[PDB]
Amino acid sequence: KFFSKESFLADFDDSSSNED
Amino acid sequence: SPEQTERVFQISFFNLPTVHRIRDIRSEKIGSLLSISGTVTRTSEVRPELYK
Amino acid sequence: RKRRPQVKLTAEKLLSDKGLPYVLKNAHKRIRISSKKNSYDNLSNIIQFYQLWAHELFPKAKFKDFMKICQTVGKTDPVLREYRVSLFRDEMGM
Amino acid sequence: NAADFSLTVLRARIALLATAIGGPDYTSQIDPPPYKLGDDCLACLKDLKRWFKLVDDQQKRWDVAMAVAEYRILTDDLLPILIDWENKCSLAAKLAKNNPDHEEFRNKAYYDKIALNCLQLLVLMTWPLIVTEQSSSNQITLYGELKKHQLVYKKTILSMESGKVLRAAIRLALDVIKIDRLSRTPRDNMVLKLVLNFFRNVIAIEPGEFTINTKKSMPKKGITSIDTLPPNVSMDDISLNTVISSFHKNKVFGFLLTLTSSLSKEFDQDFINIPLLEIMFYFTKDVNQELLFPRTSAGFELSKLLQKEHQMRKNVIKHTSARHSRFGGLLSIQTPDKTRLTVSGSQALVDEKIALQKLDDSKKWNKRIIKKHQSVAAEGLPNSLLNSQTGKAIFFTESNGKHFKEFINNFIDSGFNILLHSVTNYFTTEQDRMVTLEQVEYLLFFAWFVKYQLLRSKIDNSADIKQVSEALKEVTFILVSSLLRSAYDLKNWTVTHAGMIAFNELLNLVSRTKAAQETDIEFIVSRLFSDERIQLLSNLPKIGSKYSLQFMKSCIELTHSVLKVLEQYSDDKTLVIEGKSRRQKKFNISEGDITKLIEEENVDRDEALDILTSSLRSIEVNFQKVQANYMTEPVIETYINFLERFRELEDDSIKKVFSFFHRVFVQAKEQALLFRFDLIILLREMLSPDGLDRMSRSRKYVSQFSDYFLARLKKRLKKSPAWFVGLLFPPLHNSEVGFYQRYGE
Amino acid sequence: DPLREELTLESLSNVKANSYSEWITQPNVSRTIARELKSFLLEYTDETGRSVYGARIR
Numbered sequence: 031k032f033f034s035k036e037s038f039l040a041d042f043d044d045s046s047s048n049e050d
Numbered sequence: 051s052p053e054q055t056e057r058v059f060q061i062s063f064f065n066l067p068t069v070h071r072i073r074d075i076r077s078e079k080i081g082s083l084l085s086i087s088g089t090v091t092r093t094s095e096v097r098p099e100l101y102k
Numbered sequence: 103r104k105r106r107p108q109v110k111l112t113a114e115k116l117l118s119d120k121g122l123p124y125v126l127k128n129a130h131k132r133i134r135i136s137s138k139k140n141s142y143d144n145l146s147n148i149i150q151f152y153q154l155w156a157h158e159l160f161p162k163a164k165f166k167d168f169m170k171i172c173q174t175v176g177k178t179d180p181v182l183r184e185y186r187v188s189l190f191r192d193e194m195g196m
Numbered sequence: 197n198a199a200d201f202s203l204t205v206l207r208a209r210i211a212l213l214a215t216a217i218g219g220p221d222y223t224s225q226i227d228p229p230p231y232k233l234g235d236d237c238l239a240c241l242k243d244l245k246r247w248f249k250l251v252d253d254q255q256k257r258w259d260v261a262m263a264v265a266e267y268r269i270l271t272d273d274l275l276p277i278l279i280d281w282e283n284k285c286s287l288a289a290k291l292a293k294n295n296p297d298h299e300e301f302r303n304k305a306y307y308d309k310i311a312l313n314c315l316q317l318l319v320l321m322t323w324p325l326i327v328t329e330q331s332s333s334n335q336i337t338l339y340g341e342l343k344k345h346q347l348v349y350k351k352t353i354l355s356m357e358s359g360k361v362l363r364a365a366i367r368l369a370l371d372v373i374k375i376d377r378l379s380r381t382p383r384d385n386m387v388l389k390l391v392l393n394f395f396r397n398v399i400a401i402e403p404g405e406f407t408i409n410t411k412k413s414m415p416k417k418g419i420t421s422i423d424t425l426p427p428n429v430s431m432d433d434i435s436l437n438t439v440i441s442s443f444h445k446n447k448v449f450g451f452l453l454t455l456t457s458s459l460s461k462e463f464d465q466d467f468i469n470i471p472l473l474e475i476m477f478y479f480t481k482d483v484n485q486e487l488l489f490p491r492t493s494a495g496f497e498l499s500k501l502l503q504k505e506h507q508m509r510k511n512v513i514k515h516t517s518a519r520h521s522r523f524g525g526l527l528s529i530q531t532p533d534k535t536r537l538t539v540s541g542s543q544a545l546v547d548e549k550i551a552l553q554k555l556d557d558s559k560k561w562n563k564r565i566i567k568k569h570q571s572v573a574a575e576g577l578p579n580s581l582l583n584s585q586t587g588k589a590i591f592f593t594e595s596n597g598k599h600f601k602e603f604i605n606n607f608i609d610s611g612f613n614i615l616l617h618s619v620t621n622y623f624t625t626e627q628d629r630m631v632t633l634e635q636v637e638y639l640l641f642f643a644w645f646v647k648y649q650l651l652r653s654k655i656d657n658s659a660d661i662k663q664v665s666e667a668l669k670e671v672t673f674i675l676v677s678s679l680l681r682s683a684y685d686l687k688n689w690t691v692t693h694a695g696m697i698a699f700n701e702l703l704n705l706v707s708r709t710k711a712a713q714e715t716d717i718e719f720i721v722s723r724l725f726s727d728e729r730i731q732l733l734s735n736l737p738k739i740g741s742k743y744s745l746q747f748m749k750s751c752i753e754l755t756h757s758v759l760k761v762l763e764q765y766s767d768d769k770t771l772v773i774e775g776k777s778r779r780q781k782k783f784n785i786s787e788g789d790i791t792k793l794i795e796e797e798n799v800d801r802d803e804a805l806d807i808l809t810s811s812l813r814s815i816e817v818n819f820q821k822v823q824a825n826y827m828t829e830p831v832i833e834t835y836i837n838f839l840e841r842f843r844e845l846e847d848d849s850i851k852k853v854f855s856f857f858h859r860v861f862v863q864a865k866e867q868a869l870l871f872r873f874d875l876i877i878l879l880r881e882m883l884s885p886d887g888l889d890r891m892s893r894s895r896k897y898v899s900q901f902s903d904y905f906l907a908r909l910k911k912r913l914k915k916s917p918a919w920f921v922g923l924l925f926p927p928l929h930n931s932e933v934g935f936y937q938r939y940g941e
Numbered sequence: 942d943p944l945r946e947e948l949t950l951e952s953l954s955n956v957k958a959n960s961y962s963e964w965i966t967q968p969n970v971s972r973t974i975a976r977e978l979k980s981f982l983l984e985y986t987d988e989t990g991r992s993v994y995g996a997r998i999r
Contacts, residue, residue: 031609033457035373038450042370043293045447046286052956052964056428102427122921129920132532135910141902145880146549148906152873152924153552154531165556167563169873169924176925186925189918190933194941204968208943211967215952222954267957 058101111160111171113181120158122185203259210247210263216240217273231276238306241313244269248320256332258342261321265345270321271352274314275361281311282364308371312387315368318361319390322349322397326576343404344426350401351433359442362398365391366451377462385467392455392471395448399478402579403434436482437596444599453603456611459618469618470634476607476615477637479600480644481580483590485651488601504889511885515550517542527551568743572690575632580640582693582746587844604648605659612645613666620672627678632691635679639694642667642676643701650701650708661712667705673723676702684732689743696736696750699724703757710764718770721761726774730817733758734825741834748838749849755826756852759859766819775815783812823864829927832860832869842882847894854897861901867908868938873923879905915940947973 066085075086116122132151135144149165156168163171176182217240221232234240244264251260264270284301291299301307325346327339353361369391372384406422425431432438443449456472459465517523525542529551537555544551572583592600623630623638649664666672680695682688702724710717733754740751765771785808790801799807839853861870879902882888888895912919919937922928928937935941947969958964965971982994 031457031606033450033454033606033610035454035458035462038447038454039370039374041450042366042447043289047290047293052958053960054428056430125920126917128532130913130917133913133920135906135913137907141899141906142880142883144906145876145883145902148876149880150548150552153556157537157555158531158533158535162559162561163563164559164561166874166877167561169877170563172924173926182925183928186921186928187930187933189921190928190936193916193918194933194936205943208968211957212943212946212948212969214957215948215955219951219955222951266959266963268959269957272955272957 109162111163111168111175113175113179115159116175116182117185124155126189206251206259207263207266210260210269211267213240213243213247214264214267214269214273217269218277220276231280233277233310238310238313241310241317244317245313245320248317257334258338259334261342262338262345264321265342265348270318270349274317275352275356278311278314278318278364279356279360281307282360282367285367286363308368311364311368315365315390315394318353318365319394319397322346322353322394322401324397324400324576324578328576329574340404340407340424344424344429346401347403347429347434348426350398351429353398354438354442355433358445360446362395362442362446362448365394366446366448369451377464380464382464382467385464388463389467389471392468392475395452396471396474396478399439399475400578401434403431405573436479436590437593440592440596440600440603444596444603449599449603449606453606453610456607456615459611459614465618466622469615469622472615473619473641474637476645477641478578480604481578481637481640482584482588483600483644484581485644485648487589488592488597488648489651489655491655504891507889507891514885515543529555570744575690577633577636577690580636581697582636582640582690584746585844586745586749586849604645605652608645608649608663609659612649612664616642616672617666617669620669620675624671624675627675632688635683635691636694639676639679639691639698642672643694643698646701646705650704653708661705661708664705667702668709668720670720670723673702673720677724677727677729681729681732684736689747692736693747693750696747696754699733700750700754700757703754703761707757707761707764721765722773725762725817728776730773730822734822737826737831737834738828739830741830741837745838745841745844748834749845751834752838752849752852752856755831756856759823759826759856762819762822771817771819772814773817774810775813777813781812783808823859827860827864827866827869829869832872836872836875836878839878839882842878842887847892850894851897854901857901861905861908866938867912868922868927870905871909871912871919871923872926876923912940944968945972947976949973950977953977 063083066083069085069087072086072088075084129151134147139147153165156163156165160168160171176186216234217237218234219232220229222229224230224232247260251257284307288299288301325339325343327335353359369388372380372388375384404424406424408419452472452475455463455468459469459472519542523542525540525545527539527541527545528536529539529548530536539551539554539558541551541554544554577583619638623634646664646667649659649661652659653661676695676698679691680699683691683695706717706720706724710721737751737755740748785805787801790804790808793799793804793807794801797807835853835856839850842850857870861867879898882898883895883902888898922937928934953970953973956964958967965974983992985994986992
């Protein structure tokens, strides 16, 4: 179960956009 | 507003199933949730307790 | 000014008539362990005779403290040690 | 009057600087006042850093920290600056993601520099406060109040709009992370270390300890409180539930996961290997793994707790007199030696045992009980399982507990192995230079995550135990065993306790992996039990009785694990162990023998000479010898002392104690070890209605052991009356009669 | 001098203190209220054009 850093940047920017 | 203290929340539990009289008060039930009907004779001054 | 020494459990105290000779005289008569009784009653009967013996011997101390000072005296006093080996030697001689 | 004048001019200058950093911009009319930076304000940040350098560091004072704290620089200046930078950068990132090269910052480098300096002051001001010996008297005077100000700091960090400063800190970290690995300067990795250190400061802040002066005698009033809390700060704000909530809301957990999982491929691991382990330890120092798996349900456990309280209250009011206090009842008891002893009571009138308990309790002389005085707190260490009570429970909520479970599960499934390998790489070269703090946190991190993976694999079969497979390498074996040995030889007892916990969980992991698969398992059980470590684990219980309850419980669990892992080899006989030879073991080698071994196991002769030497120190141990070495009287003394605290403990610890008592009293067959009177008093206390509950499963085997114990006791006293003395005293050592005392001939 | 260097009114609105009395107790701030109140007493006139506090002092 590898966690990608680019996925964390994408999730950071997306939760900055709408935060769900 | 620099002064900011912890709010002293007060919990009120009303609408008990039974009401007690002053004559029915016994010392076996201290620290227990009781409801008492009565007539106030006199009231005191609104004074500050030292809480904390 | 030396007025009084506070009393402790000593070698002369165990070697009195009221002491370990009392235990050898009356412990087998007093102590009864039965399988019909439950373990609480058996253990309390073990404690009871020794507690009365402690309250007759050294009443100043509590009973757990009495067992602690008996452990200390049994580790320390040599007269008690030679009495304890004398009991075992006398019973294996017979 | 130099000292107070210097103090008031220092406080005046910090007040002037705190006014000079910035203002809330009351000129602009917005319903929340936006924070506005002051003119020439980055120089003020450098002046706070210069003041914290020149005064706090070399001159051994802490006046600057409280001078900052009473004027609320962290509360009112640094946090609004970082939160404003975070909100502006988030809005700019949104607008640049939708349309690039539109609406930029005017002075982004200045804002990034002042944000970095604010984060530097957050790390420098929330550093963990340790006061060892030979320190300055200013720090000793100021330690408690500065701990309270750090508690205010932690509450304000976690509570200010649910901790947006954590998002600011991770944004300062991903400023570094966006750069490629080859283009990253070491200053950028030091900024990453700054962010990880900030998170360890946020987690690691705990309430202080209450220190008293014992030169004067303690008065009749005594200690009225040990509360060490600031006015607005409660225990809920400091607790781990708010930490987990603020970390999950601000995505700190994903940041820690994505730096843990790619520690070797993306980041320079030597910069951030130690603060990451410190962060994991500061989560897991106060969390019990059994309570994290819960197995109306709150009301279910509440109803069972009220039933237990009702049964204990019924057993209490059995002793309570039915009449009032002034209703005087005097009882004269007699022994069969004729005497009169008077007791005063109404319940004691009828039954003998309550009357004798009154006669025992009426005495006002108490024996001295010497205390270790808890010298672990003198060292600079956080409160953990080595210091907390065994009955201490962390009360996670549903959402916070689920988020913590998900974070720990993803940590183990992603990067526990890489982090553990990197740390045991770093510490195996820095073994002789690390102070007790890194040893304790390494052993606790290892033991906690091994135990949590063991419990998760036991509860659920979806998880794999091989996810902590890098716990089972030889390097971690050498590191844990050497840490425990060096802790024992230097008489250091905190690291001994942490290594005892780590060795117990290491043996538990080995037992689980051996029970799963039936190989390298014989190699590793030969590796751990080699050298003089069997003597180490043998003499750890002999010295246990002097120390605290948690040390003694770890002695219970370690000895139970040792006997459980060594009783598996009672019939299989595979107990080859590297031993230490004392006198001459020199052998004239034969090169024909060497060459035929070269043909046998395909080896070079230098390492075949190594094998030929190592075969000479190989010995075999007897498990009956291991038991008979464990049966020494101080081991029984410390286990009886551990069984004294039977109200506080759960069923498992006393189950282990009574299993070892079955090992002593049935299997090994020497019974004079348990023929002492403290065990008899304790068994009376446990089997009483005031002690163990009748509905508990512990009382069944306590009653069975006591039945078999009194059966053998009545057999021994019927065969020999002299043992009536022998219950009182420690057992005898004279060889002419000691065989009859121990075994009855 | 650090005990003598003063500050301004929008820096007085910024409290930076735990309580009001600890802020008024602080020295350079106390001289800032001192000079501001001296300017208030000396330079207060109404729409007529007379200093009220000068006549009150008289």
